[PDB]
Design a protein around this motif. Structure first.
Motif, PDB file in Angstrom:
ATOM      1  N   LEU A  94     -19.259 -30.507  -4.541  1.00  0.00           N
ATOM      2  CA  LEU A  94     -18.729 -30.015  -3.276  1.00  0.00           C
ATOM      3  C   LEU A  94     -17.197 -29.954  -3.319  1.00  0.00           C
ATOM      4  CD1 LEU A  94     -21.425 -29.823  -2.310  1.00  0.00           C
ATOM      5  CD2 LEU A  94     -21.126 -31.754  -0.784  1.00  0.00           C
ATOM      6  N   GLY A  95     -16.650 -28.855  -3.825  1.00  0.00           N
ATOM      7  CA  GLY A  95     -15.208 -28.669  -3.818  1.00  0.00           C
ATOM      8  C   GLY A  95     -14.800 -27.581  -2.847  1.00  0.00           C
ATOM      9  N   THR A  96     -13.602 -27.031  -3.035  1.00  0.00           N
ATOM     10  CA  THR A  96     -13.202 -25.828  -2.306  1.00  0.00           C
ATOM     11  C   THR A  96     -14.181 -24.697  -2.643  1.00  0.00           C
ATOM     12  OG1 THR A  96     -11.648 -25.102  -4.045  1.00  0.00           O
ATOM     13  CG2 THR A  96     -10.756 -26.483  -2.265  1.00  0.00           C
ATOM     14  N   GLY A  97     -14.669 -24.698  -3.882  1.00  0.00           N
ATOM     15  CA  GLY A  97     -15.750 -23.824  -4.291  1.00  0.00           C
ATOM     16  C   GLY A  97     -16.946 -24.627  -4.778  1.00  0.00           C
ATOM     17  N   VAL A  98     -18.109 -23.982  -4.811  1.00  0.00           N
ATOM     18  CA  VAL A  98     -19.355 -24.655  -5.161  1.00  0.00           C
ATOM     19  C   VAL A  98     -19.965 -23.992  -6.419  1.00  0.00           C
ATOM     20  CG1 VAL A  98     -21.382 -23.657  -3.869  1.00  0.00           C
ATOM     21  CG2 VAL A  98     -20.838 -26.149  -3.701  1.00  0.00           C
TER      22      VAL A  98
END
Lengths: 241, 201
Positions: A94-98
């Motif tokens: 679970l980051g800024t993008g997945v």
């Protein structure tokens, strides 16, 4: 960033087979896929954290382990021929993008008898004289034949350096008998240079085929030489005539 | 759930190569396009989140959340764009992705001056062994696989002589037959009427 324990495996039917995916990126999510012609990627199994696993779309024949966060082990309890495939692992969090980050892939061939493993013969074919005069270009052809499994990597070397410009290798090795499950393969590649380059006798053109076969931890009771992982090459020298 | 158009797609050099991917969950929020070269691993090329276009070099992703589809357009396509392209969509809030089945895209070179020819080449180590090379034909030619169990014909392959700004198609054929000639291979995967067919010297 994401690694897999093997790039190429050949296994006998019935063998228990382990594929390792390891990431040192502390990613919570990991995934196992296989990829086949006409079916694309299919999810076998996935994991949202250490100690978790959930069956993917096609879990039958497989099991997994995630006792440590960095490693997601894919297990074939009893290898069957229909498990010959490209196996790909990936991880994400679970980051800024997945977005998922894929491992390099493992090509597994499951064969009914290791007796059918064979290294390639490799030959290099010199530019036609009529080609040179018609086009002022010179095409060399490299041909690798009679190998099994189709686990080969072919490269061209000019004067000791690997080249890419002017090269084309068949994207698919061809079965030397397409109706056959245990067919041996062939693979060709072309390298094209200017006629003046070919006509220089100090110019060296090497075709190298890396073949991945049996490991030394494999027994071999046959007459022919053990079909181990090896490099087979052929060469030509430039010719002024 | 997630469906991509089937393929393979053949696209002439300089044209737009395009892929479409529809999805069932109206509430989907993340959309990805992956590029995968033959025998390598998928690499992320674009992610897109809101309606309209997203551009990166020659790539444009487009999203239409009302009609529920996402697309990848490759502008001014080149042979080196040839690969499998896969769309992916998030299906839960943990990051699980569903991939489309991948589409193989092959960009054929623009052959401005075809010089189709069939040549016979001999082994460097033994004059006795030979292969046949059908080369320099335009990209509308199709190389049919062998129909004989004892003859072998490869797919066509695209080669770029970068220093010369010159691309060319070719295919290779061979056999372990004594009576085998090159015309036995290249003329069921038929050659055009202006093929240069030199007699072997």
């Amino acid at each position: 960033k994401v690694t897999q324990s093997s790039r190429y495996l050949v296994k006998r039917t019935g063998e228990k087979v382990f594929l390792e995916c390891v990431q040192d990126m502390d990613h919570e999510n990991m995934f196992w896929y296989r990829q086949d012609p006409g079916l694309g990627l299919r999810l076998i199994y996935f994991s949202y954290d250490v100690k978790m696993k959930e069956k993917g779309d096609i879990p039958e024949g497989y099991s997994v382990s995630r006792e440590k966060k960095e490693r997601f082990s894919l297990i074939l309890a009893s290898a069957s021929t229909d498990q010959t495939s490209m196996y790909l692992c990936a991880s994400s969090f679970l980051g800024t993008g997945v977005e998922q980050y894929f491992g390099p892939g493992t090509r597994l061939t499951v064969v009914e008898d290791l007796n059918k493993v064979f290294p390639p013969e490799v030959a290099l074919f010199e530019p036609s004289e009529a080609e040179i005069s018609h086009t002022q270009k010179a095409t060399l052809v490299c041909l690798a034949t009679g190998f099994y499994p189709d686990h080969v990597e072919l490269s061209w070397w000019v004067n000791g350096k690997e080249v890419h410009s002017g090269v084309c290798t068949d994207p698919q090795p061809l079965k030397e008998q397409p109706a056959l499950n245990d067919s041996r393969y062939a693979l060709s590649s072309r390298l094209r240079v200017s006629a003046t380059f070919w006509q220089d006798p100090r110019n060296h053109f090497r075709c190298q085929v890396q073949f991945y076969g049996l490991s030394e931890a494999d027994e071999w009771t046959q007459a022919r030489a053990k079909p181990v992982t090896q490099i087979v090459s052929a060469e030509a020298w430039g010719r002024a005539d | 759930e997630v469906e991509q158009n089937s393929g393979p797609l053949s696209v002439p050099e300089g044209a737009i190569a395009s892929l479409n991917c529809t999805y069932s969950d109206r509430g989907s929020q993340s959309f990805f396009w992956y590029r995968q070269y033959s025998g390598k691993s998928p690499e992320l090329i674009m992610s897109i989140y809101s309606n309209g276009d997203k551009e990166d070099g020659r790539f444009t992703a487009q999203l239409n959340k009302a009609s529920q589809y996402v697309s990848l357009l490759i502008r001014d396509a080149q042979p080196s764009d040839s690969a499998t392209y896969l769309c992916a969509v998030t299906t839960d809030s943990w990051g699980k992705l569903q991939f489309g089945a991948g589409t193989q895209v092959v960009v054929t070179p623009d052959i401005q001056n075809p010089d189709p020819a069939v040549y016979q080449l001999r082994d460097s180590k033994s004059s006795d062994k030979s292969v046949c090379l059908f080369t320099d034909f335009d990209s509308q030619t199709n190389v049919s696989q062998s129909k004989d169990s004892d003859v072998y014909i490869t797919d066509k392959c695209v080669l770029d002589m970068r220093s010369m700004d010159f691309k060319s198609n070719s295919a290779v054929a061979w056999s372990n037959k004594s009576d085998f000639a090159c015309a036995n291979a290249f003329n069921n995967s038929i050659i055009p009427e202006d093929t240069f067919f030199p007699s072997p010297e």
